Structures are given as structure tokens and as C-alpha cells.
Amino acid sequence: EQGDIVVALYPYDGIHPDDLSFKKGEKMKVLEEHGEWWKAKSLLTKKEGFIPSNYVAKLNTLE
């Protein structure tokens, strides 16, 4: 859901300006879920952009 903290499982290089580029282990805040791609904010760079949702996992997976 919106505001959840996620961690990158694999790195990803954005191909377009609206994408975030991240490394494995990078922490991001999910802003909006839009199917396969989510809008997120890198907690390291504070930059926002779309990320492939299959490349991240919730830091909280139990609840």
C-alpha cells in the first residue's frame, strides 16, 4: 500500500526520465501502486520515479 518501505531485490537502470534507477538493497518509499509499475521515492537520493514492482519486496512481509 501507499507509504510502505520496500527494498530492491535486483538493480535496475531506468530507460526513460520518469523511471528511478536503483541498486539491490536500496530502500524506497512506495507513493502509488499502478499495476506492474509503482511510483516511488528513493530514501537515499529523495528522487521520485516509476519502478518495476517485481524488483522490490516490502521491508515488512509478515503483515
Author numbering: 63 to 125
Quoted passage from the original study:
Lyn kinase (Lck/Yes related novel protein tyrosine kinase) is a Src-family kinase organized into four domains. These include an N-terminal unique domain (also known as SH4 domain), two adapter domains (SH3 and SH2) and C-terminal kinase domain (also known as SH1 domain). In the inactive state, the SH3 domain binds to the linker between the SH2 domain and the kinase domain, keeping the kinase in a closed (inactive) conformation. SH2 and SH3 adapter domains regulate the interactions of Lyn kinase with substrates and may help confer substrate specificity.
Here, we determined the structure of the Lyn SH3 domain to 1.3 Å resolution using X-ray crystallography, which allowed up to propose how cancer-associated point mutations affect this domain. The crystal structure of the Lyn SH3 domain contains five β-strands organized into two β-sheets. Previously termed β1 –β5, these β-strands are connected via four loops termed the RT loop, n-src loop, distal loop, and 310 helical loop. The largest differences in position involve the residues that are found within the polyproline binding cleft, G76, H78 and P79 of the RT loop and E98, E99 of n-src loop, which exhibit positional differences of 1.5 Å – 2.3 Å due to rotation of these loop elements. Conformational changes in these two loops are observed in the NMR structure bound to the herpesvirus-derived peptide. Flexibility of the RT and n-src loops has previously been suggested as important for interaction with polyproline motifs, which might proceed via an induced fit mechanism. Analysis of whole genomes revealed 18 cancer-associated point mutations within the Lyn SH3 domain, affecting ~30% of the residues in this domain. Evaluation of the locations of these mutations in the context of the structure suggests that many of the likely transformative substitutions could prevent the interaction of the SH3 domain with the kinase domain, but by distinct mechanisms. For example, a subset of the mutations, including D81N, W99L and E98K, may disrupt the protein-protein interaction interface with the kinase domain, and eliminate negative regulation of kinase activity. Other mutations, such as V118M, may destabilize the fold of the SH3 domain, again preventing the normal attenuation of kinase activity in the basal state of Lyn.
